[PDB]
Amino acid sequence: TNPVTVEVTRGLLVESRHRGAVAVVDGDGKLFFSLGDIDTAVFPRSACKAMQALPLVESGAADAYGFGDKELALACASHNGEEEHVALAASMLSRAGRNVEALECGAHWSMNQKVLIQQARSLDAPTALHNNCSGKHAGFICACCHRDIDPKGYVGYEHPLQVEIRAVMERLTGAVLGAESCGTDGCSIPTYAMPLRNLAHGFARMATGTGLEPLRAKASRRLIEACMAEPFYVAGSGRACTKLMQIAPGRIFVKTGAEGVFCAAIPEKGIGISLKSEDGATRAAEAMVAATLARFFETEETVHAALMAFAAMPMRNWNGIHVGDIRATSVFS
Amino acid sequence: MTNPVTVEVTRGLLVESRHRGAVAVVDGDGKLFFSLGDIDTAVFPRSACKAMQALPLVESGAADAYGFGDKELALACASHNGEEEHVALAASMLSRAGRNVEALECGAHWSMNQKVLIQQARSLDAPTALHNNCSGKHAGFICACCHRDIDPKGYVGYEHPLQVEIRAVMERLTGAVLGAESCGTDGCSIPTYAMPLRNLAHGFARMATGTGLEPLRAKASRRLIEACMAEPFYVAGSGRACTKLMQIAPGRIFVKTGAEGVFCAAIPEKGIGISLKSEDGATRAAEAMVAATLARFFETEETVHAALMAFAAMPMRNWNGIHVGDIRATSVFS
Ligand SMILES: [Cl-]
Ligand SMILES: [Cl-]
Ligand SMILES: [Cl-]
Ligand SMILES: [Cl-]
Ligand SMILES: [Cl-]
Ligand SMILES: [Zn+2]
Ligand SMILES: [Zn+2]
Secondary structure (H helix, E strand, O other): OOOEEEEEEEOOEEEEEEEEEEEEEEOOOOEEEEEOOOOOEEOOHHHHHHHHOHHHHHOOHHHHOOOOHHHHHHHOOOOOOOHHHHHHHHHHHHHOOOOHHHOOOOOOOOOOHHHHHHHHHHOOOOOHHHOOOHHHHHHHHHHHHHOOOOOOOOOOOOOHHHHHHHHHHHHHHOOOOOOOOEEEOOOOOEEEOEEHHHHHHHHHHHHHOOOOOHHHHHHHHHHHHHHHHOHHHHOOOOOHHHHHOOOOOOOOEEEEEOOOEEEEEEHHHOEEEEEEEOOOOHHHHHHHHHHHHHOOOOOOHHHHHHHHHHHEEEEEOOOOOEEEEEEEOHHHO | OOOOEEEEEEEOOEEEEEEEEEEEEEEOOOOEEEEEOOOOOEEOOHHHHHHHHOHHHHHOOHHHHOOOOHHHHHHHOOOOOOOHHHHHHHHHHHHHOOOOHHHOOOOOOOOOOHHHHHHHHHHOOOOOHHHOOOHHHHHHHHHHHHHOOOOOOOOOOOOOHHHHHHHHHHHHHHOOOOOHHHEEEOOOOOEEEOEEHHHHHHHHHHHHHOOOOOHHHHHHHHHHHHHHHHOHHHHOOOOOHHHHHOOOOOOOOEEEEEOOOEEEEEEHHHOEEEEEEEOOOOHHHHHHHHHHHHHOOOOOOHHHHHHHHHHHEEEEEOOOOOEEEEEEEOHHHO
């Protein structure tokens, strides 16, 4: 039933189509704009990494280990596995008296083609540090170590870290997080399906502080402001999240999830954004978060023009010929 | 009409993502055997119709003149991984026509297969036109021109006699109208022509059976389909669905992927052609859909059926090797 949110053209015709859902919620919980089904439970995957970084800050670990915005950004990141990402994750772990062996996420090659070419040339195999979640896992291990909680088995459903993350994420989103909503993430931690409406509300609360206690309100500001200050560390070279946060420095928060999830926030407008490409395609979610953010910057021509470049992405073939476009539909008007 | 949900992607107890699409199954006589969703709206077959495009290579007399075997015919029909074996053979086909990589007008790209791109990164500064998944098809085009003494320069162009011939061939096989209105530019810079899945399926069924084809075309069609089943590594390569699906039932199943979630298939002993499209263009959806479609025809061949159903319902494991959910064709296929 979800509307067609993205078209992919070739010649004079639409070659492929994507359906999806978009929730835009203010800090008080009012729905500002919606497309399609924002009530059915959806897996946020990596899109809610900023929510999961709150124990790192709220525990006092970030302060105890003298982390700045680059380590905060990396803990909120789906990074490319570039040398800067690896080194920082290694550094975050070392400051907690730990190494790569403490990571329980496993290893993978970069999903970014140019970075995988760099990795393939310089490595026999990637390590846990090269995992896009290695920053988030580093932050988890630091959160544990700072409070003298054994980080071994931190991925486990009833490890006190995962108990803390449920409690935090239920408070932010007002969603029920439990066994029936639970799945295993690519990094072997729990991911909880919840309505896009609730996920949007969670990010609006972090962005605005509305309904949050002072410590949580402050920790949420530090994380959102870190990602916007150090956008390379959230993603990296050639990535949409990094480029989208260089359009309007310090003003727009975005984060991708696996399976075509995007979360975003505009703290100055007090709004949180969540969305899902029903088929899970990254290119669709990317076109959709751009067209959605653009609705709020129509009277800022240069920002609007920069966002609309991601909402209407040209495709060139191997000879650099324009063959067609990836275009958000009129539903974003 | 809305296309039905053909593939679900699960995580824990829930459907995380879903795909819609369409399937046409047509016999040699043009009778519809099975269909899902919209099989009348024009769809770009992209690489899925490479075997139809290989007909000038055979029918011209070029394949025989240059002593091409099943491996060369398979490669001409291929979206290959850009492995050393594919590169060497594409180089060999060009060599026999008195040409080299500089004759190719497809451009260069890194392997879309992760393991092979790693090999390529470690062995190359940059790929060449030979590394292009379409280098075999383009080698065949150039070979077809060179044999008939037609200047291969500009063979990608709409009114080059090669592209005029491909149009005439594909219109005769499919019964579809191929013109500028239905034309787009493919990833390799040649024309790709949108046509109904029903017509694409009918096309492959005529190649598979020879029904309504003149003897020359019927024989070239047989040679190409038999070559791809004989040498499935040269159609795709290491770790690829097309190669593995054509090792389930050797000599019996023809499959070919197209960009944007197209699949074509054929079971010549059953007289059927298959075409399908994941509406969102996902590869994983088109793969689950072609396997679930083929499986309907092998329900009394338990070992073939179980091998196809492994692709119809593919498990997903995370970086630690933990089963997280499945990619499953829906009950519309059973
Ligand atoms: Cl993930
Ligand atoms: Cl709170
Ligand atoms: Cl292509
Ligand atoms: Cl293309
Ligand atoms: Cl004919
Ligand atoms: Zn993760
Ligand atoms: Zn091609």
